[PDB]
Design a protein around this ligand. Structure first.
Ligand SMILES: Nc1ncnc2c1ncn2[C@@H]1O[C@H](COP(=O)(O)OP(=O)(O)O)[C@@H](O)[C@H]1O
Ligand SMILES: Nc1ncnc2c1ncn2[C@@H]1O[C@H](COP(=O)(O)OP(=O)(O)O)[C@@H](O)[C@H]1O
Ligand SMILES: C[S@](=O)(CC[C@H](N)C(=O)O)=NP(=O)(O)O
Ligand SMILES: C[S@](=O)(CC[C@H](N)C(=O)O)=NP(=O)(O)O
Ligand SMILES: [Cl-]
Ligand SMILES: [Cl-]
Ligand SMILES: [Cl-]
Ligand SMILES: [Cl-]
Ligand SMILES: [Mg+2]
Ligand SMILES: [Mg+2]
Ligand SMILES: [Mg+2]
Ligand SMILES: [Mg+2]
Lengths: 638, 638, 23
């Protein structure tokens, strides 16, 4: 009765009108970001030279140079009528006017440099609907930025040093991250009419470019550009109502920050367009999941993709050195990566419709492949896609950082290692070949889902872990620690948290899913089943008493059966839920977060599918006239 | 429930207001297309002379000359405010902004010549709502263009040569294709509240120029002219809510590309006018299906319809020549054509309401006919219509290319063939005389739907095939091969694949139909049926105790029987669906696509009608007040 | 049946024309 108010609701939905600032991008791209182009303008001759010396790998920022900046910074934002400032920061999961009483007692607006939990001098401040946002690092380390920043640092020092063995120059090596954002959209109305979709982000049940949308994108993009994020492409995915959008790569940290922000933008904007953006990795069951690829590469300060072969690759010894290296890292750090992308949501995705199974294994592709013996296809975790590697394992909701923090530090180590080792001008070839032979195992090239590879790799010793809890545990696994704590990225106490808070999440997520599905079953689904069952009963009940037993026996036949069928399901559900409620109960009591997790993945998680199977069947039986929830057919097209 | 929210929805539907750019067509026609008229304008004195030499049969395009073009192209696209570019291409049944980071750190908009999967230097790029499109191919050939092109290439040379025997000149011979698009419209509102239709594109069940619409064509037409499709006509068809719309013949390729987009252009504009364009060959059962005619003809650079008789058809030996020739092609390549237009949907179409049966046979009509012995009514696949032939067989949803690929390549062959023979200045008459008597069997002129012919052909050896699977298989039969794989059109594998993906489709389509129907029945129809039945029962039940068994006997009668009638049907259905679901189950399991096809055609496909038959009766019985779906009577009028 | 006057001229450019041949 509300589901329909939804269908009828969207019968008419004039797609919003947009605009487009000027016809020249250059006119507004970055319009809303206090970037150099503008610090040079608004900041004092000196203060500016300082933001640079600081961002020029050097720093630090004087409490003096701060106010120097901060003041200039505001002056800019005022040009946008911003009236509040805030420390923007993504934690492992506040607006202030400038208002201030002056000496003379009169009120004034002021932004003290004393307000930079520490601003990431690296990422420019940006403005969103009257609010200056200062990217900062939450402080162990309760955020994501810090861990990354460090991870990225290590990678640099490391790769730079190892770069020395060639072109003596090369002061430093940067990390470029090009991400690809996938998602689904649902008309808000329909969405609300589906409680499991709200609250869980994914349908917990259910039997398996439009103008409206275009306009959504029309805006999103503009707003992104203004925000500095360089959105390059946008197209719709394999599944219904699924779409992607990717920008041009950017020094990892920024890239990430940017993506993070984009998700924000998308949500705010979507709502405005009477849509709901679904970022879960598996919104609808039985249809392409959503993923977030991470195209990784390492540009050196003197130039050089450092991952780009190009003409006679056997000659480009530098490249060879790095490629083979990556190989070792991906290989030597399987579990670590698979952990940086595992999540209650992603679990539902990887290992399926175009989603890499939890089995890391690089793809070099014939050409470069055989070439490695001398010493582009998806369906696989890592993949050399040409002058860069693409890491598909990542979920679509995850914060890139995680995946990067791992991959990068992991690489950092593997490098600093290759270096020490290759220290016994012609040695390289020794270690290089030593490593190629060493990796081998890790390299693959075919149907990554094929039952072929399922064992074909298990044989090589390549681990395969589906269970989130387990898969996660490996954060504390010695090898990982060697990389994480090794490279001074985390200290015991920290890594400890990380792993917990991570398990913590999973546990809750799995819980809510359960909680919801339980209530929805008992409160929404069942009550209907009954209602319909009555329809059926009232039928026989009368029929039976109007036809000769003979007639009634043959006419009621099937009907009578279905009633049984229904009564069966209902009861079944009634139980499963109870039992599940119990499971959760006990589970919730395991005196140890670490166990609590397993408890769920172990005994609770299972019911989710159990309960469903029934509901779904019921959906097929009951009258479409009724049936509380919007049906997939509608969530996907109607 | 919704079926009414529909009738009510369209009680008030103001037909949109259009405009009309200027009053001088010449003003806005081909406005959004980067045609030479404009290349000359935007392109450098030489870079232009290059795109011309390219499309002057010559080519190729320099990576340099590309960028040269590529840039002028943008300079233009901007005057229209385009901001994205994409590769427009029709694969076997994608949006980048110009954004670019400059050397000097600042952002620019750039369109590298490096972006021309290979552009069809031929068909001009066109702009559509801020998005520039570049017709391209899909390189094995995973598209339709490539083939067609190759196919057309052959026909050119192959015909230029034979042409040589006469007027020594004649550099080449072009192919003109004048299509004719048919369709149906349904008020979106009704549509949506009719699953089968949305999803299957055609009603799976159901018992058997308004302002709103004019406004549609009003806009549809303008947008075409702005785009270069020279739409010349638009009138409504034989059935309700059906309408044609045809352009002025253009070189087969361009002709095609145009149509192929007009399909898009329509679907877009359509929604905008609360309509849904139904391109399926047979939306509604029992009323003219939609078709797409292909008016073929060959012009030789030095003029000449080459299919144009004119005063004294004996003098025109060239014509006579070609005529006879085509006559052979249509005869010698029967099954090849039939397969180039066979499709799950079209199956429900041809061989009926003005649609040619699966029995290829030409039509010359008295005049040219008897006079062809000296050595226009529809109801017929091919039909010489005067200075051109008309290929009625084609479905209204197909990609003209398919039919052309055959037609042309076939002709190309049968032409080159003639040239062989006629190699022994007067000989031609020998060969021509041969083919004439040789074709014979293929000419016809009467009621093609006639039984006197449905058999009168079988005698002549004229093949007749309905079952898509079968009819398709012939793509592989050696004759076809001789022409297709023969003329460098497809290579052994390719053609093999084409037949695969083709069969693939058929199977998918048939499944989704079965899928749906199954649900709509059990799920939507049945439940109502019961509801009504109760009304009937509650009637008898009560009256059975207020009247003398005598009276009750006489009054129950009918009622009682209908109750039976209904109970019969609903049960009947419950089964067929079951049985059907099972059939599919199996079919689905045959290990080969080729098998799966015949599987459906043979045991799943058959059910669609069985199940239906009942539902439709039930429709007639149940109370109009109820009945979930919009009635045909409503879908075709009000 | 509705027909625009649309028609391709010799020069290839499009023009609108109504031929007496239509009466
Ligand atoms: N040198 C590079 N370094 C990092 N990322 C890159 C580099 N070159 C390209 N990329 C990224 O490759 C990604 C390609 O995205 P997309 O085309 O949508 O998916 P696929 O790469 O699977 O086609 C983009 O994010 C692009 O920025
Ligand atoms: N010389 C020609 N070459 C190709 N197509 C042509 C030629 N002459 C006419 N046509 C096409 O004949 C078609 C006639 O369409 P129409 O009148 O709607 O259907 P019918 O041909 O069934 O009357 C138009 O598409 C026209 O362009
Ligand atoms: C077609 S795909 O590989 C599909 C990816 C899949 N949806 C996933 O979740 O990884 N997307 P992309 O075009 O970014 O490669
Ligand atoms: C009415 S009709 O012949 C179409 C007849 C039938 N609906 C068909 O699809 O061939 N249109 P046209 O103007 O092309 O002759
Ligand atoms: Cl509830
Ligand atoms: Cl709980
Ligand atoms: Cl349904
Ligand atoms: Cl199935
Ligand atoms: Mg994508
Ligand atoms: Mg990708
Ligand atoms: Mg027509
Ligand atoms: Mg016709």
């Amino acid at each position: 009765k509300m589901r329909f108010f939804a269908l009828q609701e969207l019968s008419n939905r004039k797609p919003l009108e947009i605009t487009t600032p000027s016809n020249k991008l250059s006119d507004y791209y970055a319009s809303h970001v206090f970037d150099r182009k503008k610090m040079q303008e608004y900041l004092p001759k000196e203060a500016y030279k300082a933001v640079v010396d600081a961002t020029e790998k050097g720093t630090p920022i004087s409490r003096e140079m701060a106010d120097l900046i901060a003041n200039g910074m505001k002056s800019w934002a005022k040009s946008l009528n911003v009236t509040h400032y805030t420390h923007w920061f993504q934690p492992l999961t506040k607006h202030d006017g400038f208002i201030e009483f002056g000496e003379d007692g009169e009120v004034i607006e002021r932004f003290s440099g004393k307000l930079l939990t520490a601003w990431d001098g690296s990422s420019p401040a940006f403005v969103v609907d009257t609010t200056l946002c200062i990217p900062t690092i939450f402080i162990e380390a309760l955020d994501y930025k810090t861990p990354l920043l460090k991870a990225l640092a290590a990678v640099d020092k490391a790769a730079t040093e190892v770069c020395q063995l060639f072109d003596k120059n090369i002061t430093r090596v940067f990390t470029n991250l090009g991400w690809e954002q996938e998602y689904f959209l649902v008309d808000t109305s329909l969405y609300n009419a589906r409680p499991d979709l709200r609250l869980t982000g994914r349908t917990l049940m259910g039997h398996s470019i439009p103008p409206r949308v275009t306009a959504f994108m029309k805006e999103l993009e503009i707003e992104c550009h203004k925000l500095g994020i360089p959105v390059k492409t946008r197209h719709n995915e394999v599944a219904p109502n699924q779409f992607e959008l990717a920008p041009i790569f950017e020094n990892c940290n920024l890239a990430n920050d940017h993506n993070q922000l984009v998700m924000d933008l998308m949500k705010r904007i979507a709502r405005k367009h009477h849509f709901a953006v679904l970022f879960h990795e598996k919104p609808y069951n039985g249809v392409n999941g959503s993923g977030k690829h991470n195209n990784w590469s390492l540009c050196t300060d003197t130039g050089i993709n450092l991952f780009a072969p190009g003409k006679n690759p056997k000659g480009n010894m530098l490249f060879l050195t790095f490629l083979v290296n990556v190989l070792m890292m991906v290989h030597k750090n399987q579990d670590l990566l698979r952990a940086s992308i595992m999540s209650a949501g992603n679990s539902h995705r990887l290992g399926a419709n175009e989603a890499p199974p939890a089995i890391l294994s690089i793809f070099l592709g014939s050409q470069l492949s055989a070439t490695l013996d001398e010493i582009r296809n998806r369906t696989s975790p890592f993949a050399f896609t040409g002058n860069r590697f693409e890491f598909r394992a990542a979920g679509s909701s995850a914060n890139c950082a995680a995946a990067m923090i791992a991959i990068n530090a992991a690489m950092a180590n593997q490098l600093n290692e290759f270096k020490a080792s290759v220290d016994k001008d012609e040695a390289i070839f020794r270690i290089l070949k030593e490593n190629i032979i060493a990796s081998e195992l890790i390299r693959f090239e075919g149907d990554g889902y094929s039952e072929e590879w399922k064992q074909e790799a298990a044989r090589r010793g390549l681990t395969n872990i589906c269970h989130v809890p387990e898969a996660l545990m490996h954060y504390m696994d010695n090898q990982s620690r060697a990389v994480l704590i090794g490279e001074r990225i985390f200290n015991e106490t920290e890594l400890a948290c990380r792993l917990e808070v991570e398990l913590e999440k999973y546990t809750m997520k799995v819980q809510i899913e359960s909680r919801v599905l339980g209530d929805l079953a008992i409160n929404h689904i069942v009550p209907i089943a009954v209602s319909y069952q009555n329809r059926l009963l009232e039928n026989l009940c009368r029929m039976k008493e109007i036809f000769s037993e003979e007639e009634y026996e043959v006419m009621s036949a099937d009907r009578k059966e279905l009633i049984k069928e229904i009564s069966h399901r209902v009861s079944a559900i009634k139980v499963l839920v109870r039992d599940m409620t119990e499971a959760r109960k006990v589970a919730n009591h395991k005196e140890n977060f670490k166990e609590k997790a397993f408890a769920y993945e172990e005994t609770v998680r299972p019911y989710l599918e159990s309960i469903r199977d029934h509901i779904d069947h019921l959906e097929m039986e009951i009258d479409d006239e009724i049936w509380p929830l919007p049906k997939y057919r509608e969530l996907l097209f109607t």
